[PDB]
RNA sequence: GUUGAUCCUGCAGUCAUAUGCUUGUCUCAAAGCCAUGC
RNA sequence: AUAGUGGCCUACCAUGGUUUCAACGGGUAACGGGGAAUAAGGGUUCGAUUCCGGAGAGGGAGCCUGAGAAACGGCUACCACAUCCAAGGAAGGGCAGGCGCUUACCCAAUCCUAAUUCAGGGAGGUAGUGACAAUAAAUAACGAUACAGGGCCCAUUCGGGUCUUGUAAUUGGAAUGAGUACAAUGUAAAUACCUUAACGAGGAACAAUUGGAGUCUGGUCAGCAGCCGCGCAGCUCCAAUAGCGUAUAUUAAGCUCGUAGUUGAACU
């Protein structure tokens, strides 16, 4: 309620509005971008320099973003910072099991206002049967995924595309309908980059090499809670790593000054301002003659009763210069205290809809936590009695685990999205969604328990005079556990008496009934194995 | 239409399916709507039993109502005394359905086999192909109910599955 | 209720209600403050668990139980049941037919 | 004209509000804020 | 004075004119009627009416054209009143439309106009929009054989009555349209509609459901002895059917007098 309140007030025309065009690579996304900006600037500009600052008057300026459908990272990176989803669809999607999983990412990380745009349904359809298919898509999406969004249908008029009233309906929905607040986004300072300049402190043998990072001046506008408040704060560069900032630039008789002037002694602050340690809690007073004679009369207390940024970096290293490219959009985050730390985190999970596998504990998983993408081994555990007595081997449809792993710690219990990684040529989406959940709590130094099983198969048993035919081969083992308490999966406990110098399985023990002849007589509580760190 | 007064009542609920068992229907909606028309007639039927004998209302709105019941093919002409009109019952409108008259006239060996033969562009009564099972034959159209000129069982084409069976013989056994 | 059929509210915390069948498996209850009245009303979630789905501190839709008051059984005096978190209707999240929003 | 026992039987309706799920074919369902233009 | 008789207007003179089977004053939230549907004519709806009459085109006064305007969908000036400025000056009238409860094509017909047998018409006509409702019916029909029976009903009972039964692609031919597609009709040029050769099934099919019970099958849980225990996954059955629930409401068994007030004999 106050997290939406901090966002809207400084936001005005030079802070843009975030709009992404997301869709398949084959369709004319770029054509829709050109005809969309054809309405804004006068009638003829059909050249793409994206991302670029779109000056849409003094009322609302915007900035537009597209990303290719094969990039696994920035498809995630665009999803959490958006304020409008504009999806372009074909006449060939809807049960395509490998091309439309990003819908779940926008479902989980925060859904803004969404849009369906139908364009290739004219070159493919020629008859009255397109009307039932469009309404069929209205049965699927987006009317079922959110009640309160409009599915648009546009003509296929690829390059040569209209300026007329249909993008006045599109710019009607863009121009009028605004954004719903995203909770955990607006508690962080976060900024999209607009311009990007490389300052190298000109040519020297300490300017280029194998290890040289230079002063990058980056340029953009602010979003969320204010980042310029102090120099030398922290930041995250997506895909590259977490860094600090060196120097940030911003382009949109008094005791209160003398206290912060640290070349002045505090007795000179008191001395200039008019006219010893907190290890003594009780404050200073004068002598009893002075306070007594001074406070003989008590009259003196008788009323006392009834925008734009120019950000400087000393980063990043030389190998990212060789990964320079046209600006496939890059976003800056801001890390908080109790999240710069590392720790073991406990998080609730479940299995994901339109996913077709199972998850062992040894296959590492790619996790998106806030602004950070990290590969971590997801060791699962369950309780069965409001206390843990086992772990599991792979998270089923049967039960839904309590997952634990080690990485960056995240106190405010954020929602938690887990992608199984594929290559750039496996499905058609850069990831495929493995599981989703929520950070439940933070807990360092916890220890999982897996109860193994020493095996003894019964054959002929009575209560007091009890042997096991086949359970052991060493006598000194039983000599050590003679002070212990044994079991059976049926639930009538035993207590071993004495090894009796027979290391053949046969030895005398105790049960508080006679264990039955279709039972399994065992022993419990085995070694509490460690956590894989990565 | 109109729903009956009680939805679940034992002697009437089993009396549904013995109508659905003989005639072979699919919905009690197709039972209730038939009783609904029999409801509206019967209220009017009791109206002309109160008024005077040889009232022209009892003549013009009586006998034409009587003759229309002979015209639809339900009231036999021996019972033409306006006192059998109260003694009408539910199955007689069910008996004049287009589905059941097929089975009575040989040709169907079931009431469910005739249901399939209605909806597959088969049997016509006049020169109009009828594919609604409730066509309500008017008793002047019984001995015109017959297999179509097209749509085999009537000839001159054997049909897409018989021609496909002919097609299989020519390609593997022949050439 | 105030006479109407439903009331929309906010989770404060998650309690503990257990069972005897099939064995001691936890059936739970949740604590919801009313948005419109400020009275604090408990509720029950009829399913296999589903405490996992909802959260602390989110938006629910309470609903009546249908007996003119009159709590069902050995759950002590709980009169209301939960239908919708975030507008997406728990039963649809129960099968798999929806995925829950961000909050 | 006045006291008891035995036998028999007995002790749902709502177009009336909101909401959830699926429907191959046919027909019929202000005295606030602004997209925009002079 | 006007196109025109006329207190219509002005000076004179007279003191008059209407009205008890009823002048005038006054209410009907229906801006007015002829008319259109259900058809008691009483009534509902529209009178914002299919035909016309009164109001207003930012508010004012003056002025015009035409046989027909009091033209604002004609002009000048006044007043509120804002837009541009090269700083001289120039200019429009605060309007619609939409949300809050995405609107295109054509004069082929009718009629009107025409520099008029040409063409035009913000006259006119033709497509977008759909569970509060609701409409028809598809999801299969008919044959064949070998294995096999402790099969079904009533009393939850103690027990009794009736045995015509199903599991196997054993297996075979039929029959069809949901949909795919030229052609023609339609023809505002024209879209859809009425027709149509060509295709097209043995269950992965060409992918119905929302329910409901069930003393059923499984898994390591208070808490412990002298001995014996307790509390998601395998299917089966019942229901209407493109429809089925859920929550709230709802229908059916102290004494007495005495006023307003009320009621009360007979009879030519």
Between CA A252 and C1' E86 the distance (Å) reads: 33
In terms of Cβ atoms closer than 10 Å to its own Cβ (0-12, 13-18, 19+), residue A283 is exposed
Nearest C-alpha of chain A: how many angstroms from C102?
Answer: 5
Set of chain C residues whose Cβ sits within 8 Å of the Cβ of A182: 102
Q: Is residue A37 a contact partner of residue A215, using CB atoms and an 8 Å limit?
A: no
Q: Cα–Cα distance between A32 and A166 in angstroms, integer?
A: 12
Those residues whose C-beta lies under 8 Å from the C-beta of residue A139, and which sit 6 or more positions away, are none
Q: Which helix (H) or strand (E) holds C60?
A: strand C59-64
CA atoms within 13 A on the CB side of A533: 8
First vs last C-alpha separation in chain B = 61
Q: Strand E: which nucleotides have any atom within 7 A of a protein Cβ?
A: 102-104, 129, 135-143, 173-177, 179-181, 192-193, 199-201, 211, 218-233, 240-242, 246-249
In terms of Cβ atoms closer than 10 Å to its own Cβ (0-12, 13-18, 19+), residue B62 is buried
* Phi, psi (degrees; rounded to nearest 5) at A232: 75, 20
Those residues whose C-beta lies under 8 Å from the C-beta of residue A273, and which sit 6 or more positions away, are A253, A255, A258
* Phi, psi (degrees; rounded to nearest 5) at A8: -80, -30
Q: Cα–Cα distance between A219 and B89 in angstroms, integer?
A: 89
Exposed e or buried b for every residue in A386-408, given b needs 16+ CB within 10 A? Answer: eebeebbeebeeeebbbbbbbbb
Between CA B11 and C1' E181 the distance (Å) reads: 55
Q: Cα–Cα distance between A210 and C55 in angstroms, integer?
A: 50
Q: Cα–Cα distance between A36 and A115 in angstroms, integer?
A: 15
Set of chain A residues whose Cβ sits within 8 Å of the Cβ of C26: 386
Q: Is residue A38 a contact partner of residue A46, using CB atoms and an 8 Å limit?
A: yes
Tokens of A73: 């990272």
Q: Is residue A389 a contact partner of residue A471, using CB atoms and an 8 Å limit?
A: no
Q: To 10 degrees, the CA torsion angle through A145, A149, A153, A159?
A: -100
Whether residues C99 and A108 touch (CB distance < 8 A) is answered with yes
Q: 3-state class of C22 per DSSP?
A: coil
* Interface residues 3-22 of B with strand D (CB < 7 Å): 3, 5-8
Q: How many CB atoms lie within 10 A of CB A68?
A: 14
Tokens of A241: 């790593």
Tokens of A428: 């058609």
Q: Is residue C26 a contact partner of residue C18, using CB atoms and an 8 Å limit?
A: yes
Whether residues A353 and C26 touch (CB distance < 8 A) is answered with no
Q: Is the peptide bond before A142 cis (omega within 30 degrees of 0)?
A: yes
Tokens of A275: 């006219």
Place of tokens 């400087």: A312
* Phi, psi (degrees; rounded to nearest 5) at A451: -85, 110
Q: Cα–Cα distance between A281 and A148 in angstroms, integer?
A: 61
Is C103 an interface residue toward A (CB < 8 Å)? Answer: yes
Q: Is residue A235 a contact partner of residue A248, using CB atoms and an 8 Å limit?
A: no
B touches which chains (3+ CB pairs under 8 A)? Answer: none
Tokens of B106: 């040989």
Q: Cα–Cα distance between A167 and A172 in angstroms, integer?
A: 8
Exposed e or buried b for every residue in B108-140, given b needs 16+ CB within 10 A? Answer: beebeebbebbeeebbbbeeeebeebbbebeee
Is it the case that chain C and chain A have 3 or more CB pairs lying under 8 Å apart?
Answer: yes
Residue from the list C52, C87, C103 with its beta carbon closest to the beta carbon of A348: C52
C touches which chains (3+ CB pairs under 8 A)? Answer: A
Mode of pairing for the β-strands spanning A18-22 and A85-89: parallel
Q: Cα–Cα distance between A192 and A371 in angstroms, integer?
A: 13
DSSP A438-458: EEEEE-SS----------B--
Tokens of A186: 């607006």
Tokens of A326: 């046209």
Shortest CA distance to A227 belongs to which of A5, A10, A76, A415? Answer: A10
Is C55 an interface residue toward A (CB < 8 Å)? Answer: yes
**Three-class DSSP labels, A184-236:** CCCCCEEEEEEEEEEECCCCCCCCCCCCCCCEEEEEEEEEECCCCCCCCCEEE
DSSP A133-146: HHHHHHHHSSTTT-
Is C4 an interface residue toward A (CB < 8 Å)? Answer: no
DSSP state of A517: T
In terms of Cβ atoms closer than 10 Å to its own Cβ (0-12, 13-18, 19+), residue A517 is exposed
Shortest CA distance to A137 belongs to which of A124, A147, A151? Answer: A151
Q: Is residue A434 a contact partner of residue A395, using CB atoms and an 8 Å limit?
A: no
Q: 3-state class of A129 per DSSP?
A: helix
Q: Cα–Cα distance between A356 and A366 in angstroms, integer?
A: 17
How many angstroms separate the Cα of C73 from the Cα of each of A414, C41, C45, C62, C76? 37, 18, 14, 19, 7
Shortest CA distance to A68 belongs to which of A18, A20, A119? Answer: A20
The experimental method, as deposited, was cryo-EM
Q: What is the CA radius of gyration of chain A?
A: 34
DSSP A369-407: ETTEEEEE--EEEEESSSSEEEE-SEE-SS---EEEEEE
Q: Which helix (H) or strand (E) holds A7?
A: helix A5-8
CA atoms within 13 A on the CB side of C13: 3
Nearest C-alpha of chain A: how many angstroms from C67?
Answer: 32
Q: Cα–Cα distance between A99 and A87 in angstroms, integer?
A: 13
DSSP state of A181: P
Q: Where are the domains of chain C?
A: 1-103
Set of chain C residues whose Cβ sits within 8 Å of the Cβ of A400: 52
Helices A166-176 and A29-40 cross at an angle (nearest 10°) of 80
CA atoms within 13 A on the CB side of A70: 6
Q: Cα–Cα distance between A194 and A307 in angstroms, integer?
A: 12
Q: Cα–Cα distance between B168 and B171 in angstroms, integer?
A: 6
Q: How many CB atoms lie within 10 A of CB A482?
A: 15
Q: Cα–Cα distance between A480 and A469 in angstroms, integer?
A: 19
Exposed e or buried b for every residue in A186-210, given b needs 16+ CB within 10 A? Answer: bbbbbbbbbeeeeeeeeeeeeeeee
How many angstroms separate the Cα of A455 from the Cα of each of A471, A496, A515, B89? 6, 15, 15, 78
Q: Where are the domains of chain B?
A: 7-175
DSSP chain B: ----S-S--HHHHHHHHHHHHHS--S-THHHHHHHHHHHHHHHHHHHTTTS-TT-HHHHHHHHHHHHHHHHHT-S-GGGTTTTSSTT--THHHHHTSHHHHHHHTSS-SSSHHHHHHHTTT--BSSSSBP--TT----SSSGGG-B--SSSSSS-S---TTHHHHHHHHIIIII-
Tokens of B28: 């009690």
Q: 3-state class of C51 per DSSP?
A: coil
Those residues whose C-beta lies under 8 Å from the C-beta of residue A501, and which sit 6 or more positions away, are A475
In terms of Cβ atoms closer than 10 Å to its own Cβ (0-12, 13-18, 19+), residue A319 is exposed
Q: Cα–Cα distance between B108 and B100 in angstroms, integer?
A: 9
Tokens of A238: 């997506």
Q: Is residue A38 a contact partner of residue A104, using CB atoms and an 8 Å limit?
A: no
* Phi, psi (degrees; rounded to nearest 5) at A349: -130, 180
Those residues whose C-beta lies under 8 Å from the C-beta of residue C82, and which sit 6 or more positions away, are C30, C43, C44, C45, C54, C60, C61, C62, C63, C90
Q: Which helix (H) or strand (E) holds C94?
A: helix C90-95
Q: Is the dihedral of CA A268, A270, A276, A277 positive or negative?
A: negative
Largest CA distance in chain C: 39
Tokens of A313: 């970096």
Tokens of B170: 């020519």
Q: Is residue A407 a contact partner of residue A342, using CB atoms and an 8 Å limit?
A: yes
Q: How many CB atoms lie within 10 A of CB A320?
A: 15
* Phi, psi (degrees; rounded to nearest 5) at A284: -80, 140
Q: Is residue C59 a contact partner of residue C8, using CB atoms and an 8 Å limit?
A: yes
The length of chain A, given as a count of residues: 534
């Amino acid at each position: 309620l106050h997290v939406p309140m901090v966002d809207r007030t400084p936001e005005d025309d030079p802070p843009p509005f975030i709009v992404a065009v997301v869709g398949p690579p084959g369709t004319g996304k770029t054509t829709l971008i050109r005809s969309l900006v054809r309405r804004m600037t006068k009638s003829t500009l059909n050249d793409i320099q994206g991302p670029i600052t779109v000056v849409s008057g003094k009322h609302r300026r915007l900035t537009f973003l597209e990303c290719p459908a094969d990039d696994l990272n920035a498809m995630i990176d665009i999803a959490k910072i958006a304020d409008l989803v504009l999806l372009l669809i074909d006449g060939n999607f809807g049960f395509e099991m490998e091309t439309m999983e990003f819908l779940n990412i926008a479902q989980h990380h925060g859904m803004p206002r969404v849009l369906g745009v139908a364009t290739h349904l004219d070159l493919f359809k020629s008859q009255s049967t397109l009307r039932a298919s469009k309404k069929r898509l209205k049965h699927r999406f987006w009317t079922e995924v959110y009640q309160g969004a409009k599915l648009f249908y546009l003509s296929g008029v690829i390059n040569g595309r209209y300026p007329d009233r249909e993008i006045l309906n599109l710019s009607r929905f863009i121009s009028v309908m605004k954004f719903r607040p995203l909770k955990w986004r607006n508690e962080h300072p976060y900024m999209l980059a607009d311009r990007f300049t490389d300052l190298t402190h000109p040519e020297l043998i300490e300017t280029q090499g194998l290890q040289i990072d230079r002063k990058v001046a980056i340029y953009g506008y602010l979003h969320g809670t204010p980042l310029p408040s102090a120099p030398g704060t922290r930041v995250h560069i997506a895909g590259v790593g977490d860094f600090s900032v060196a120097q940030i630039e911003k382009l949109p008789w008094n005791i209160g000054k003398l206290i912060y002037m640290d070349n002045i002694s505090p007795e000179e602050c008191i001395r200039r301002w008019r006219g010893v340690d907190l290890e003594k809690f009780v404050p200073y007073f004068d002598t009893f003659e002075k306070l007594a004679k001074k406070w003989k009369s008590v009259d003196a207390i008788k009323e006392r009763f009834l925008s734009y940024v120019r950000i400087v970096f000393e980063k990043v290293p030389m190998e990212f210069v060789k990964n320079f490219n046209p600006k496939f959009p890059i976003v800056m985050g801001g890390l908080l205290p109790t999240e710069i730390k590392f720790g073991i985190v406990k998080a609730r999970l479940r299995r994901h809809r339109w996913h077709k596998k199972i998850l062992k504990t040894n296959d590492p998983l790619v996790l998106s936590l806030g602004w950070r993408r990290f590969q971590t081994l997801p060791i699962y555990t369950t309780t069965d009695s409001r206390t843990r007595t086992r772990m599991l081997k792979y998270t089923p449809e049967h039960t839904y685990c309590n997952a634990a792993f080690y990485g960056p710690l995240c106190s405010p219990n954020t929602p938690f999205c887990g992608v199984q990684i594929v290559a750039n040529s496996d499905t058609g989406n850069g990831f495929r969604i493995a599981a989703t959940g929520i950070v439940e709590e933070i807990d360092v130094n916890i220890e999982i328990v897996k109860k193994l099983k020493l095996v003894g198969f019964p054959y002929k048993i009575f209560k007091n005079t009890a042997f096991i035919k086949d359970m052991f081969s060493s006598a000194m083992e039983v000599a050590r556990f003679e002070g212990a308490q044994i079991k059976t999966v049926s639930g009538i406990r035993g207590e071993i008496k004495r090894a009796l110098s027979k290391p053949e399985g046969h030895y005398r023990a105790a049960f508080e009934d006679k264990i039955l002849m279709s039972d399994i007589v065992i022993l419990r509580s085995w070694y509490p194995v460690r956590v894989k760190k990565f | 239409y109109s729903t009956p007064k009680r939805p679940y009542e034992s002697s009437r609920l089993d009396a549904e399916l013995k109508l659905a068992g003989e005639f072979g229907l699919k919905n009690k909606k197709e039972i209730y709507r038939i009783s609904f028309q029999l409801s509206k007639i019967r209220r009017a039927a009791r109206d002309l039993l109160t008024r005077d004998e040889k009232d022209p209302k009892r003549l013009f709105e009586g006998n034409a109502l009587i003759r229309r019941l002979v015209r639809v093919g339900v009231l036999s002409e021996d019972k033409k005394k306006l006192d059998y009109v109260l003694a009408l019952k539910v199955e007689d409108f069910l008996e004049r359905r287009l589905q059941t008259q097929v089975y009575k006239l040989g040709l169907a060996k079931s009431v469910h086999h005739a249901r399939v033969l209605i909806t597959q562009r088969h049997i016509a009564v006049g020169k109009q192909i009828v594919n609604i099972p409730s066509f309500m034959v008017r008793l002047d159209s019984e001995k015109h109910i017959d297999f179509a000129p097209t749509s085999p069982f009537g000839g001159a084409r054997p049909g897409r599955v018989a021609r496909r069976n002919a097609a299989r013989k020519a390609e593997a056994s022949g050439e | 209720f105030g006479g109407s059929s439903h009331a929309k509210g906010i989770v404060l915390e998650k309690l503990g209600i257990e069972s005897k069948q099939p064995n001691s498996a936890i059936r739970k209850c949740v604590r919801v403050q009313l948005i419109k009245n400020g009275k604090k009303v408990t509720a029950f979630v009829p399913n296999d668990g589903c405490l996992n789905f909802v959260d602390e501190n989110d938006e629910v839709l309470l609903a009546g139980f249908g007996r003119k008051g009159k709590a069902k059984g050995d759950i002590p005096g709980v009169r209301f049941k939960v239908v919708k978190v975030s507008g997406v209707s728990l039963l649809a999240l129960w099968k798999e037919k929806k995925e829950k929003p961000r909050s």
